[PDB]
Structure formats: structure tokens, C-alpha cells
Symmetry: none
Subunit: 457 residues, 2 copies
């Protein structure tokens, strides 16, 4: 018996992405088995595994780790730190019954690389952001450790950073804003240090999207300067409630609209809009003239790092008469069925926060994106997709890291997105490349095979 | 761009197969390009005919060296894939600093056997010829059963031919890897034997990457073949015995009359590929008989007119894949063996030339998948197989209402399908080869 142990990152999004690649690995090598270790959050996994076939399910096991006690920005980090001993024991126990081919860790979970080192087991990272961001975050840690450049000092409008694999200088203004906090800067640098200790890094991208970055990693690996990096994506989650029923209503409305005529606006799992920003969007949407599906959520009260909620009364928040005047032009919704909308033939553009899964989803369906970065590494993602790759346009977002984007600037971005024609052509060609990369013979298909072959040595 | 250069061997069973694995490799990794160098006889795949000048191959060494050097100009020469008969080019690859590989189109068991014969004749001075006796048994790595000296290929009787074959086996050991047209579940003990030997740094890596099969303009043999398939469409499932003897097999009149007696007495439905040896030496294609009604027993074609069909060259894979076909009297060439297994058609063995006597031994005695017809050796010329022995072989093939060998063949057939699909043994073995090539 030969086992890979997965420790997914927090959230059903990260669980789902991890289980998609777990299924892929099991289908690509019948000798492989997988055990998934899930970590409880003190506030079901088998459901998200796409297989329905006993040739595959007989080879995967799911274990929930024993819940643990302990007394913020480091909340999830602390829970995973309390679970290291449980992971170590679970992994040690499994290795009594199997050849332990490796511990596969979500990039958030790389504190567990220590556990693999202590047991003498190979470690691998499942890196769920872009290859370019892997290069950027590693280079920031390297500058800080080897050249004494503390990251806070680079976070300036007059600073440019030479990132391996990038033609364009990377502005210090797109360093993720959380690096200004010294505790969090050190945590992220330490993640990057741990990446370098592993036996290989799976990245959710395809090499034709990020070819110069992937070449830079290939060179570094050949010089023993970095682990092997495997571009194996796009790994996407493409397959009762009333939020699911409002989703069918939107799709039904989308069915009656003309092809590529609807602008979709959606801002990820933690994004939200304050009332004044929402009113500026509304004004811009009404003035733009294009059909729209607008996912609109309010920030959680008493908790900026809580999950966003829906607006109780959108009629009191939005401009007077907006919903009446736009009743046949567009729809406003809460949580959205995003992939169904992006894959719908009526959808013509995507105003996106540029989270990496939203970026890959829009690329997969060939929908051009107008960028509106908000948190995490979204500002860098918008720079890579816009300035470096030329696949996206910006939504007049000069502010990069409490400044509102005016209706004039939003309408200017929608005009570029929908009125340009050259970018849409580049997005369609890249979309075709994304579909072929994961098919037989494609770059991500063969890179996944190469990873499996390394693992099975 | 990364190039693999193939030098295939002669004959349908060697050349068609090399083109199939070249096509498979090109489909399986788009980073790959393939050039095929064709040795004459007396979007990403390229064919080169080498200029015309057994020892055919050695006169071509310099043309091969030069074509390979010229390709190495606009591409990364990942390696040279050679047929088992072309491995004199291992020197060319060595001289040019390029990895060499063998694409071995016979069984892994035969790879072990021919390598062991070379090992015995290299240490001990005794020639292989002195083992080709009825009271000789050979311990071949990977075989539970001792291998009779009777099934050493007959060509080993010639001192010069045996030495050249030993030279081939010696050169296999010098390559970077041997790809074999088999799947590990078919020959698992042999493949374990190679894995042990490679791990002890005693043999190149051996990749079981098959079955590699040729399943695929208007012609007259195309037309007769189409007639056969239409006739098969009208027969009950597993009701027809197919008889076919490879690209060089043929039947003399007395042997053909014994087959005709057996078929008429057995009462089974049949498709019988009947060809006579070319008067122009066995180094040319067999041909149909003229006026077959004057060759076969009197009235045979009249009495069997609704029971079966006699043809020349046959659409073999189409017949083996047809649901009416229930059994295959076969010369046990390795491609025929793989094709019949793929379609789950049990074989009754009638070895004739090359390594077929060994293949029949491996499939029958060692693996239990085939049934034997008679007991002739690799060096017995002209011994007629009686109608009675043929009848008994066909009874075992078609009977049981019994069906125990058919059950093993069906289960082995399913294993052959799975081995080359996503995740199977041969799928991942080919990936390991592709990885080595791309490294
Ligand atoms: O209303 C929404 C918002 C987001 N998503 C999905 O949630 C994920 C968002 O991930 P991304 O990496 O883009 O951003 P994050 O949530 O990590 O900031 C994607 O799969 C979206 O399709 C969704 O289905 N509905
Ligand atoms: O009448 C015939 C005889 C042979 N074959 C094909 O020729 C090949 C024979 O290869 P094998 O290795 O069995 O024997 P060989 O020709 O090398 O003796 C196989 O692909 C058969 O399907 C065919 O199509 N029709």
C-alpha cells in the first residue's frame, strides 16, 4: 500500500480544490492511495469528492483530526499550530500500514512541513495561487533574509522590484497589504522558507499562462536553488437552499439574454461593498447601458475578518428607484453561482476582485476580466493579468496595497471591458490553451504525470 | 523541440508496431517530436528514407549516424529507439553522445530467453546449437517451468546466425532502456525478474508499455475481407473458428487437405486463411492457391459452402474483434497473440517460424492461456499435423456445454484493456519512459 496524505487548507474552497487533485492523482495511477486529514475549526469532507466509482473511492480515506483547545489575524494559523502533534501521530500511524510516499500540504498548512521532516517523509506543497505569486512571495522572503530588505520598506510608490520570471518591474504598491504588519510579514516569509524545504510544489496554473515564470523555476530547480515546481492546473470546482434557488432564478434570467451581453460583478468569498461604494457601482451600471448580474454583499458587523452577509434592505441602500429603472436590464444578488454564470453563453465580461480561482474560472470560460483587487494578493494578481500578461483591464484602480472608486471610473472600466476588442481576442486564445493543457499530452497533464512518477520512486 | 529518432525493423509486425508507439508517444506528450529513419530492403512526425546501398543494417550505420547528427542541429536529440534487429546502431548512439533504447516487439519472456541464451554462450563456450535437443531444459529467468531446448528458435541452429543474434542481445544490455510490447499483468514473473536485475544494476530498465496494436484505399483484398465481415455479421456469437498463419506462414497441399478434413469433421463454422509458399523462396510473400477445388479434398468447398469461407490475406484484427469469432488457430506470432488477447479470443497454437514455438510454450505451458495442437520442435521441418490433432485442438477451443480456458482469457483480456488506459501498468510505465526522455 502506497499512501499520499493530504492536509487541505481552511475552507470548502480549499478542500474542494484539494479533493479535485486527489481524484486526479488516483485516476492517473492505480497504485496510489490517498488519506485526507481534516482540521476542525471550533466555530462533511467526503461529500466534495468527485468519483462515484469504487475503483477510486476504495483508495481514499478521510480522517477528521481530534479537536483541540487554545485561546484575530492569526486565528486559523493558531488552530493549525495546535494540530501539528495530531498530524504527526496520524501520519506515523498510517506509515505502520503503508509506504508513506508523502505529505501534501496546502500552502497555508506548511507549518506541517516540520512533521514530515521529523518523520523522514517527503513533503509537497499544493500552492493554490499563481506561479507568479509563488515567485513574488519567495523573492520577498529572499530579499529580507539575504539582503536585509524588510518588506515594509519596499511598500512605496517609488519602489520597483525585479521578480524572477517577470519582464515588467513589480511595483512595491502591489505587495500584499498585510506585509506592513511585522508579525504577519514574518509569518508569510516563514511560509516561503518552508516551501523551499519541500520535495516539490504543485501550482494551480498552466505553464502557457505563466511561461516565463515557469521557465525561471525550471532553471532554478536545475541549479538546485528551488524545489521542482509542477504546473498542474487549472484545477477547478465546476460541478435545496434559497441561495441555490436564487441562483436558478439568475440562470433562468440569463437564458433569455443575448450572447456575451451581460457584465457579471462578483468579489470572492470575503469581499464586500460598503453602501457608498455600492451606490457608485449602481450609478455606473445604470449609466453604462449594459446588462448586468451584480453580486452584492455587506461587510459583517462587529468583525472585519468575519464572513460577509446580504443587505437587509437594498432599496434603502441603493439609489432611489435604481431597482425599478434597471428591472429589465439587470439583477442584484447575494452569493452567486459563479461558475454557472461564467460558463453561461450570455455572460460577456467579469468585474472581478482577481482572486486566483476567479481568475482561472474566467479564463476557462473565456470571459475577459476588468480587475478590482481588494485583499490578499489580488493587487499583484491584477498587475500580472493586466500589465504582464495583457489579458485583463483595470477598473480605474490607482489605489494599490479606504478610498472609493467613483462611478466615472467604474463606467470607464466597463466601457473598456465591453466596448478591448483586442484583449477579448487574447482571452479567447488563452482559454483554448487552458482547456488543452489538462487534456492528454498537454503541459499540465504531463506535469502531473511527472509529479506522480517522482512520488512513486 | 525534443526529438526521438526511430529506426524500425522489417516486416508488418515490426514496422507497423513502431509507428503505433511513435503515434502514442506523440499523443501522450506534445513536447515530443519523432523522426523515423527507414532502412531500404532488397505535424510532429517526420519520415526519412535512407539512401540505398541481416547485414543490410550494418551498411546503413554511416547513413544513420549522419541523419542523426543532422537532426541534432535543430532539436534536442532525446534518444534513438531501435528495433531488436537494428541494435548495431547502439554504437552510432554511443559515438554521438545520444541515449539509445530498444523497442522490443516480441514478448518480455522472449527478451529474457534470448538474453539468457547469449549469457550461456558467452560464459560457457558451448554453442546454442548444442542445447537444441529433446533432452535439454533451460532455466530462463522469470519462468516457473523449464524452457525446452526444442523451443529455441530454429535460426539458432546456424553458427553465423546464432552469433549475430547473441550480438544483438549483448547490445541490448548497453542501451539506456528497453521498451517491450507487453503488459506486466500478462508476464508478471518475467517483469519482476527484470525489475530485480535492473535494481541490481545488471540490466537496463525494461518498460512494459503494451499492448501496442494496429487496430486502425479500396483494394481487392479489401473487398474479399469486407465480404468475410458481412458473412460473420450473420453468424451466432462465438460460433466461428478463424485460422491464420502470419505474414510468412503458408500451407503445403497435404497439410491443407488435413485441415480441410478436420474442419469438415468438426462441423464448426470457419474462416480459413489459406496461402501457399511463394515459388520464389520463403523470402517472398505467400500467395493464394489457384483452383483450390483441385487441391483440397474433392467436394470440400461444395459441402462447406454455408459453413465457412476460405480466403487469402485476411482482415485479421477485424475478424478477431468480431463477435461471431470464437476461437483462433494461430501461428503464435507475438502481434497475433496480443490481438487475440485484446479481443478475448482464445488461441490454439500452431507455431511455424521465428520464436513462435517459444511463444506457444509461454502462452500454453507457462501462462495457461492457449491450447496446443501438436508437439513439433523448432527444428522439425515437414512433419504433418494430422486432422485428428486439429480436430481435438478445435474441440478444446470451442467446447464446454469446459469453458475454463475461455474464462482465463476473458479475465486476461480485461487486464490488457486496463493496462493501457489512464492509471494502468503500461500507461504509467510509458510515462516513466517519457520522463527519462524529457530529462
Ligand atoms: O458569490 C460568490 C463568490 C465566490 N464564489 C466562488 O468562490 C471562489 C472564490 O475564490 P477566489 O480565489 O477567486 O477568491 P477568494 O474567495 O479566495 O478571495 C471561486 O471558486 C468562485 O467561483 C462563488 O461561487 N460565489
Ligand atoms: O492474413 C493475415 C495475416 C496477418 N495479419 C496481420 O499481420 C501481423 C502478423 O504479426 P505477427 O507478429 O503475429 O506474425 P509475423 O507476421 O511476424 O509472423 C498481425 O498484425 C496480423 O493481424 C493480417 O492482418 N492478415
Amino acid at each position: 500500500k502506497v499512501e499520499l496524505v493530504f492536509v487541505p487548507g481552511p475552507g470548502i474552497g480549499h478542500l474542494s480544490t484539494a479533493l479535485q487533485i486527489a481524484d486526479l492523482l488516483l485516476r492517473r495511477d492505480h497504485r496510489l492511495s490517498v488519506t485526507v486529514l481534516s482540521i476542525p475549526l471550533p466555530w462533511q469532507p467526503e461529500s466534495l469528492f468527485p468519483s462515484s466509482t469504487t475503483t477510486t473511492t476504495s483508495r481514499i480515506r478521510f480522517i477528521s483530526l481530534p479537536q483541540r483547545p487554545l485561546p484575530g489575524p492569526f486565528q486559523f494559523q493558531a488552530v493549525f499550530e495546535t494540530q501539528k502533534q495530531n498530524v504527526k501521530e496520524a501520519v506515523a500511524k498510517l506509515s505502520d500500514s503503508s509506504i508513506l510516499a508523502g505529505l501534501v500540504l496546502d500552502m497555508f498548512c506548511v507549518t506541517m512541513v516540520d512533521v514530515a521532516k521529523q518523520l523522514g517523509v517527503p513533503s509537497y506543497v499544493f500552492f493554490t495561487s499563481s506561479a507568479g505569486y509563488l515567485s513574488f512571495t519567495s523573492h520577498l522572503q529572499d530579499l529580507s533574509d539575504r539582503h536585509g530588505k524588510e518588506t515594509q520598506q519596499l511598500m512605496r510608490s517609488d519602489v520597483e522590484i525585479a521578480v524572477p520570471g517577470f519582464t515588467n518591474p513589480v511595483p512595491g504598491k502591489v505587495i500584499p497589504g498585510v506585509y506592513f504588519n511585522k508579525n504577519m510579514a514574518e509569518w508569510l516569509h516563514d511560509c516561503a522558507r518552508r516551501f523551499r524545504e519541500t520535495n516539490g510544489i504543485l501550482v494551480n496554473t498552466f505553464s502557457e499562462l505563466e511561461s516565463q515564470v515557469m521557465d525561471s523555476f525550471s532553471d532554478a530547480t536545475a541549479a538546485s536553488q528551488f524545489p521542482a515546481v509542477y504546473a498542474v492546473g487549472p484545477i477547478l470546482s465546476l460541478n435545496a437552499s434559497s441561495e441555490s434557488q436564487s441562483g436558478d432564478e439568475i440562470l433562468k434570467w440569463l437564458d433569455q439574454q443575448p450572447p456575451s451581453s451581460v457584465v457579471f460583478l462578483c468579489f470572492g468569498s470575503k469581499g464586500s461593498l460598503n453602501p457608498d461604494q455600492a451606490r457608485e457601482i449602481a450609478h455606473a451600471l445604470e449609466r453604462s447601458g449594459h446588462r448586468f448580474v451584480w453580486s452584492l454583499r455587506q461587510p459583517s458587523p462587529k468583525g472585519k475578518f468575519e464572513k460577509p452577509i446580504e443587505y437587509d434592505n437594498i432599496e434603502d441602500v441603493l439609489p432611489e428607484g435604481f431597482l425599478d429603472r434597471t428591472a429589465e436590464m439587470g439583477r442584484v444578488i447575494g452569493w452567486a453561482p459563479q461558475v454557472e454564470i461564467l460558463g453561461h453563453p450570455a455572460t460577456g465580461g467579469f468585474v472581478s476582485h482577481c482572486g486566483w480561482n476567479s481568475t482561472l474560472e474566467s479564463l476557462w470560460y473565456g470571459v475577459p476580466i476588468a480587475t478590482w483587487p481588494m485583499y490578499a494578493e489580488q493587487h499583484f494578481n491584477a498587475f500580472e493579468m493586466g500589465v504582464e500578461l495583457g489579458l485583463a483591464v483595470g477598473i480605474s484602480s490607482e489605489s494599490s496595497i479606504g478610498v472609493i472608486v467613483s462611478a466615472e471610473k467604474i463606467e470607464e472600466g466597463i466601457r473598456k471591458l465591453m466596448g478591448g476588442g483586442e484583449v477579448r481576442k487574447l482571452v479567447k486564445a488563452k482559454s483554448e490553451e487552458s482547456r488543452k493543457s489538462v487534456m492528454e499530452g498537454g503541459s499540465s497533464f504531463t506535469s502531473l504525470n511527472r509529479f506522480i512518477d517522482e512520488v512513486m520512486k
